[model samples]
Target: SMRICIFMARGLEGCGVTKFSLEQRDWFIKNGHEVTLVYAKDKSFTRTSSHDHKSFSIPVILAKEYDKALKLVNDCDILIINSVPATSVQEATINNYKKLLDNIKPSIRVVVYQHDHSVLSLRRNLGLEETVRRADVIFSHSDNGDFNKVLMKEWYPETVSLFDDIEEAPTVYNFQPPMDIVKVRSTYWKDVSEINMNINRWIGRTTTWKGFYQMFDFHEKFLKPAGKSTVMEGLERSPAFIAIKEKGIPYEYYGNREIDKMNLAPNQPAQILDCYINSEMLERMSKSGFGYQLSKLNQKYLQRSLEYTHLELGACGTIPVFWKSTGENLKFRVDNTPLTSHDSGIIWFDENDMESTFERIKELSSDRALYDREREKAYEFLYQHQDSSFCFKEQFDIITK
Candidate 1:
């Protein structure tokens, strides 16, 4: 048995990193390891600059209490830094991290788990290049070597030489769905014959990089014209959606009786919810026919990685759609082969050729045999490649060794 401590940003409620950390904590405890979570509170940071800090609802130890918090990690055998405080490039955040690292015992294995492609850029901006340099090993969710290569080549080229002295090579450590949710989702899986082709779902944060605007654009142009509707589950009041409304794109709230009484054609309204609790979100996803998991492709530093939503949707037996550009970044294995093949369980749409993409979605909606085949493939792929038993075991071995 080993003592493991995870230090990460814990401010944002429903943040992917925090979810993964908690899941990881549970897995460690179940597997007979002692685990602790040290949260870094970010009082001012928000995903959207215009938004307030209300999202930081997770309990955390304040900056002044960091000294007391650092003591929790003292006796741990392995220290994993997930996403640092606020993901802020500010000097104070960097200095706090430096002090946090300074207090760690030299015998402990410090692992830096890179969650974002821009981590290098953030590290550079903070002028704390040695933060990751002091780590025993670095890991990313992406198995593709090119994913790590891009970080070195574009974000921080100087780090390439810095890594020459390090013995262990940087590699992949994929995230796993919470086993409890996975088990629950398995029971909700539907055969293609049972799925309602007319129903579509979209779930994600309101970040511009998540392709919220593009989703609205697709809804207005294609789905509405095709006599179909989508259920949008996320933070509807975010600046991104507010901007969509500002642009004059029309959409109704999910359950407004007045709008329902009008009997709107195509039923193009967003099913915006208060919050996406795991069980509820998974249940809703399980009932959907298909969904969109769009991502930004134009960003230079953004590397393709498997998202939690994609996994959850697959677990619920829903077909996930992705941009062709985003698909190209996903690899089948550490061998760097593309995972965008016809059998890869992803419905791919091109950003430039969105018309054709919409047509393909229509084709899937119309064909039961086609939808079943795709769903089956996705189910197999997700279970085979992303099983928690395999993924977490590999991660545990690496951290403990």
Candidate 2:
């Protein structure tokens, strides 16, 4: 097994970047490989960014520790540069490799995986071109031909190989958790059997990302009126959240008040939870087996991106209900005949048809048999494609071979 080092944006802050990297680390370690993380912050930072959540400290190379960072890079067999904003850490990392590669004999294989869409924005503005040329393998999370065409047109001038070397490796990795996370989710089955499923709806993190605000606002507009005791959690104060009190929508919020910064209506059903790490959040979330996601449609790149929430929640025995438009945009879906719409094992709703959407959600919420059948199928799909054993095996073949 190889000593694999991954360079991402933040420390083990509750962001998708750290979560994705750590999810992989857990798998690699279990499979007898050493995985090291290098990130900008060494300590847990406030959860302000779109990907940000709560914080936990894990071993990581603080990029400011340049001497130690270089040592780790030199020691690893595979160095993966996952995307980050154009920061001092990122610039210094590229410069260190340029300056030190000659001295480091028997060079390690470098994988420049553009795991964030922000990389395009970073390159477009800063023109940090050298990183792509130096990488052994260049990949993009958004790899459609049209997306590549735009990247090539803009950044190809900075490097001779940028356009030719890029490959379409979707950011989809095995984010489905360890045995413990699965067990945390499994308890929901027993709870439901005992008639203890209490949560009405699980509204996941609210972000500034496209369609996210509307996702919350729509519930305020539609679902709340229908009398759903939705548990919505987020770390940012969007206009929707700030205006939620006036809207008179009933929502149970769980997150830090400082981060959310939202004033609630008198006697609002809300409790501010401190952190997500080691919490029963996922376990509690699993009880609601039915949640909705609509943020993907608002992004420029990766409009079709399938986030971790969809599969992780499902595998944990939660059935995700998606925006109809967003569901069509997903890269993966089940079918009939084969399997038909009767059991895509997933559900969809449209913004234009908000009434019927909530109606359908309400219908499914009480239908135990339908929920279990769909949930089981969802688990099967995840085990087949998104499980750590399968995804890591395929990913390692690309990096090592």
Candidate 3:
């Protein structure tokens, strides 16, 4: 068994990256490997805000103490760098990360996982191009070379030199779901008959680039007119909410206390929750029956990478609606066909022809038998294809080779 270390900017408790890292650490430990976690300690780190729970009991080294951090990282057999080399707390900077990269022993393998397209641009702009050059392997959700090429050529022209310097192309690595949660979700099959077909769920950050405006437009133009309601679980005070208020889409804001106190009723007015943990989010998604998966920047800015949001919805037996462009990237079937077919697990809608999308939702809502079949199909497809063990093992072999 090899010694593995995961390096991150901070170990925030609820952050997606930290949760993914912890899941990776658990898998490694279960497989008889020694795992260490290294983080650039930020002042904002707290019991509530950061991982202070018992599950995070693995050996940890904070980068605030440079010498100790360097020694621990240098001793590892493999170092997996998660996300970019910058943090909001400024504890980890490009120069600091470069020093860590420079001091690592040649025998130790270095793997860089790009979590987002914006991260690639930031890495170059912030002077972490050397980190890219020094990496033994670079991985991303998208395998298409043209994705990175176009991104660099359009917004980050100077960073395009990174591809020329690298010996091999960036490898495609799929997201590994938390197996513990997946296992639990698998056992309790969702009762599709009881799901609220009238409610559509939209979860995640409400950034405009993420299609926050589109969500509002969808609600105004179709959902409201069709007598349907939306349930949004994200930051309640995001700018999108400000715009949503102006548009006068009726919604009720629920904090953590309100959500715990009562159950949400079907066909209720539009609802918004401040936030929910992963399990809570999935539980809600399972009942919502439909999920919004469109993003404004996905096609051009993100190169149509298969988003983790789609997997989350699919795993919970929620039918996710995606834009036609973004849905084309989900080539999950054995026959190399897209998974977003009309009668398949998920639905892809034309952005220009949203009226048809509304009609499809109306059709599904009326036909319980079809919805039940599709829900079961979706859950099975994701559970079979997106197995974390299989995906993680593939990543493990590539990084160690």
User: How close is every model to the real structure, measured as TM-score?
Assistant: 0.76, 0.73, 0.79
Question: How do all the candidates rank in terms of TM-score, highest first?
Answer: 3, 1, 2
Top candidate (lDDT): 3
lDDT of 2 by residue, 17-78 (tens): 56566666777778898877666453345552333222532244443565665676678888
Stretches > 4 Å off in candidate 2: 9-13, 42-44, 47-64, 85-106, 118-128, 145-147, 158-191, 194-206, 238-275, 298-300, 303-305, 333-342
RMSD list, candidates in order? 5.6, 6.0, 4.7
| lDDT tens per residue, model 1, 34-119 | 88776666453333222122243223454555566667767699887766554443555566667777878999998877665544
TM-score of 1: 0.76
For candidate 3, report its TM-score: 0.79
lDDT (Cα, tens digit) per residue for candidate 3, span 293-356: 6754444333323445656777777787766665565555334465565346566666789898
How displaced is residue 260 in candidate 2, in Å?
Answer: 16
Sliding window of 10 residues with minimal summed lDDT for model 1: 48-57
lDDT score, residue 81, model 2? 63
Each model's lDDT comes to 0.62, 0.52, 0.63
- Give residue 59's lDDT in candidate 1 (0 to 100): 39
Better of 2 and 3 by TM-score: 3
Lowest summed lDDT over 10 consecutive residues: which window, candidate 3?
Answer: 43-52
